[PDB]
Design a protein around this nucleic acid. Structure first.
Ligand SMILES: CC[C@H]1OC(=O)[C@@](C)(F)C(=O)[C@H](C)[C@@H](O[C@@H]2O[C@H](C)C[C@H](N(C)C)[C@H]2O)[C@](C)(OC)C[C@@H](C)C(=O)[C@H](C)[C@H]2N(CCCCn3cc(-c4cccc(N)c4)nn3)C(=O)O[C@]12C
Ligand SMILES: [K+]
Ligand SMILES: [Mg+2]
Ligand SMILES: [Mg+2]
Ligand SMILES: [Mg+2]
Ligand SMILES: [Mg+2]
Ligand SMILES: [Mg+2]
Ligand SMILES: [Mg+2]
Ligand SMILES: [Mg+2]
Ligand SMILES: [Mg+2]
Ligand SMILES: [Mg+2]
Ligand SMILES: [Mg+2]
Ligand SMILES: [Mg+2]
Ligand SMILES: [Mg+2]
Ligand SMILES: [Mg+2]
Ligand SMILES: [Mg+2]
Ligand SMILES: [Mg+2]
Ligand SMILES: [Mg+2]
Ligand SMILES: [Zn+2]
Lengths: 122, 215, 37, 160
RNA sequence: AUAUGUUAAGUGGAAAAGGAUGUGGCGUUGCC
RNA sequence: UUGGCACCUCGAUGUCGGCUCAUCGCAUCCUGGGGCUGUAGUCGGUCCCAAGGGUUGGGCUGUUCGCCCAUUAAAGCGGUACGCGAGCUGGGUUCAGAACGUCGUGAGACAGUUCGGUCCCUAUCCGUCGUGGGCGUAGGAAAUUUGAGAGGAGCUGUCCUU
RNA sequence: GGGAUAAGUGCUGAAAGCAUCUAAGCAUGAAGCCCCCCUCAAGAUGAGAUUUCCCAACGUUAUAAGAUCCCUCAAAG
């Protein structure tokens, strides 16, 4: 459950460490976003030498949330943190690695490169 | 089309084909009997009257609705049925396919049938604009003295009155509500039960009317 | 369609007619179609 | 009226013919008598207008009962087709769905090369309406001429 | 109500420059 | 709108912005329909019909406004005492303190600025939202109803295929 | 989805021999109008309809069918 001003860890090696959510995309009046949704964010904290730098306005896909998600079989998955991945327009990751587990809903979202690079897909 | 009366028992869930979780409402629709057939020639419209949930027979000095009074008893005997607790009319069905005094079984519906369910929603008593009409609160701090009030109710000299239809506090719930395009999940002839996908109006034990969907 | 208070022929082929109580100009040239209004 | 002022058909007056190609009855204006030949009463403006239009309608009835009417449409464009699906017409005019134009009484459809369509009937108004609907399915476009045009109708063509 | 005519816009029952084969009455002339 | 006039109100008609709650107009912002195009297509320009619904979350500023960030189908323009303080707030603005610039001999003052500065009221009538009692409906009564009429709802994106 | 329409688009058609969507006729045509969908509704004093129940004598007394008072309550408040 990600809204404007929510801060998210970045689960890739693109340079960004923490981002702040600027906008939840996908319609007028949309307030919250979850796993697989795309957000506009600003990089509040970055590591040295990364492609993505502090102060940049980028787009990211949410890959895990504390709220988690509910699947049609009545099962749920929840994570210990909110983490996102910086993406390009082609939905490919800007970084070259993905850290930590990501939700399988990314596959339905067509973030196949992220799913492939993830060390675990639950 | 098709129609039946029942009591809402409660909510549960089932697992469909491919394992998806289907939340369902259990409706017990035993003891449904056609009491009357209204026609255009006599009543001006076509309908079948269905009684549901047999009650006790008439007795002298009855003090509650558990016992049929003499008018109700005569009305039921004309159909050769026990007096019923709930009586409702169905206009959607075709009256030429029913006889007076015939049972309306749960086997009338079939799994996959699309239905509309009508019932009296749960009562909530006297409620304010925030809950009853879903309005916004005023600020809770910053010196505010406006929290759950309804706000401005009109304009100035024009119009010097409050319009009809203004949203204000008052009794909430207890209204007739129709939920449309639900699905019949399962019909269980023993126990006379229909499983409706989703949820329906009213408290547990409340009367519900199941009809074939208009749309 | 030109909707104008002042409708008048624009070439020699323009024709002034009245339809449903409105003064119009019709022509082979669609640009010259005019209605008063 | 200059317009206002037959054959083995009936012309048995309201009017109702019994010609070779059908009956084709109607009412005509109620203030105009006939001897055929119509006559204008009171010489008023409305009287003259109605005299002219009544004479035209009567001549049309005679012509339709005698030799009928035929409107011809042509389809221009690569892949455009017109089939006769039994009695009705089916048009493939570049849409994602074929268009079904349903035949009507005293009206018959014909197709040549599945490109030139013809509407035949006793009633001039009905034939004109059917032709106008077949045209309205897809009217001509000014840049290439594609569409269902009238056979003898001029199409204004614009450049690229 | 009576006689004669005008309007078809509910004009009558809120407005202009300007536009128009609306319609009635006077006419001046060109062609036949 | 800025004004002109001084006709209601000075034995008081609370002023700006915001909040809450709306309601109406159409000169229509989006969506629906259409004509023309200097309309190839995708896009556009312009005019006509159309008020059903819809029409944002922030940074700055008391602000209205405006600029900017990021969205959206769209982020329309106006009326309702520049709608709405016996519904709220009180940042600004007519108050007593103090200071700067400036003017004044001075007391003090301001096409100015700056920090601080008490928002009362138990609803009689109409109105509105709910909820009962009486009588009427040509016998009395239980239940089921028709529907004159009224209210509600009415938005729209993206993707695949053709 | 059905009916009637707006701006439009016409067909037939004269006044005006021709032309002309119009003057009489005939079509078509909007998220809009009237319905369709949901809710309330006979104090609709125009007070409607159906089924069933009840039936006395001398304003009075007692009553019918049926309601209540009072009492135990909750899905209602
Ligand atoms: C809080 C109670 C006071 O209300 C108010 O102060 C307000 C909030 F209600 C108020 O200011 C009203 C609204 C005022 O009226 C406005 O006046 C304007 C000029 C015009 C406006 N309209 C016409 C446009 C009027 O509505 C005025 C003049 O009160 C000062 C009304 C007059 C009748 C007035 O003087 C009254 C009598 C005023 N007052 C003097 C208080 C004088 C100041 N004060 C004293 C105290 C106090 C005293 C003792 C103990 C404690 N703890 C406190 N608290 N406040 C009281 O003792 O009581 C009240 C009612
Ligand atoms: K009644
Ligand atoms: Mg709020
Ligand atoms: Mg408080
Ligand atoms: Mg001009
Ligand atoms: Mg008028
Ligand atoms: Mg003024
Ligand atoms: Mg004076
Ligand atoms: Mg004053
Ligand atoms: Mg006074
Ligand atoms: Mg308009
Ligand atoms: Mg800040
Ligand atoms: Mg105001
Ligand atoms: Mg007020
Ligand atoms: Mg001072
Ligand atoms: Mg000095
Ligand atoms: Mg302070
Ligand atoms: Mg009605
Ligand atoms: Zn022209």
């Amino acid at each position: 459950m990600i809204q404007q001003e929510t801060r998210l860890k970045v689960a890739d090696n693109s340079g960004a460490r923490e981002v702040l959510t600027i906008k939840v995309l996908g319609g007028s009046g949309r307030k919250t976003a979850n796993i697989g949704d795309v957000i506009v964010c600003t990089v509040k904290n970055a590591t040295p030498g990364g492609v993505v730098k502090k102060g940049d306005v980028v787009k990211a896909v949410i890959v895990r949330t504390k709220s988690g998600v509910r699947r049609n079989d009545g099962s749920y998955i929840k994570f210990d943190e909110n983490a996102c991945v910086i993406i390009r327009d082609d939905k490919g990751p800007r970084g070259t690695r993905i850290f930590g587990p990501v939700a399988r809903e990314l596959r339905e979202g067509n973030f196949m490169k992220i799913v492939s690079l993830a060390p675990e897909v639950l | 089309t098709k129609g039946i009366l029942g009591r809402k028992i409660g909510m549960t869930q089932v697992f469909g084909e491919n394992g998806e979780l289907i939340p369902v409402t259990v409706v017990e629709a035993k003891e449904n009997v056609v009491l009357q057939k209204k026609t255009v020639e006599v009543d001006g419209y076509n309908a079948i009257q269905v009684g549901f949930e047999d009650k006790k027979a008439y007795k002298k000095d009855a003090k509650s609705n558990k016992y049929a009074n003499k008018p109700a008893e005569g009305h039921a005997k004309k159909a050769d049925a026990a007096p019923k607790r709930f009586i409702r009319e169905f206009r959607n069905v075709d009256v030429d396919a029913y006889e007076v005094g015939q049972e309306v079984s749960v086997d009338t519906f079939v799994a996959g049938d699309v239905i509309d369910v009508t019932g009296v929603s749960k009562g909530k008593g006297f409620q304010g604009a925030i809950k009853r009409h879903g309005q916004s609160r005023g600020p809770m701090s910053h010196g505010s003295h406006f929290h759950r009030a309804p706000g401005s109710v009109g304009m100035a000299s024009d119009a010097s009155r409050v319009f009809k239809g203004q949203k204000m506090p008052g009794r909430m719930g207890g209204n007739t509500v129709t939920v449309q395009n639900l699905e019949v999940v399962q019909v269980d002839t023993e126990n006379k039960v229909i499983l409706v996908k989703g949820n329906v109006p009213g408290p547990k034990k409340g009367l519900v009317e199941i009809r074939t969907s208009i749309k | 369609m030109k909707v104008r208070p002042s409708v008048k022929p624009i070439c020699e082929k323009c024709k002034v007619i009245k339809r449903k109580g409105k003064v119009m100009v019709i022509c082979e040239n669609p640009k010259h179609k005019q209605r008063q209004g | 009226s200059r317009v206002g002022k037959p054959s083995d058909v009936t012309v048995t007056f309201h009017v109702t013919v019994k010609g070779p190609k059908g009956e084709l009855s109607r009412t005509l204006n109620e203030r105009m008598t006939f001897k055929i030949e119509v006559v204008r009463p009171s010489d008023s403006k409305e009287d003259r207008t109605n005299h002219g239009t009544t004479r035209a309608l009567l001549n049309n009835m005679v012509q339709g009962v005698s030799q009928g009417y035929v409107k011809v449409l042509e389809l221009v464009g690569v892949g455009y087709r017109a089939q006769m699906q039994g009695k009705d017409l089916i048009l493939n005019v570049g849409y994602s769905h074929p268009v079904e134009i349903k035949a009507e009484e005293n009206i018959t459809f014909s197709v040549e090369k599945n490109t030139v369509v013809k509407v035949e009937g006793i009633s001039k108004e009905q034939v004109g309406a059917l032709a106008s609907n077949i045209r309205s399915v897809r009217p001509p476009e000014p840049y290439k001429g594609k569409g269902i045009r009238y056979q003898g109708e001029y199409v204004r063509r614009k450049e690229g």
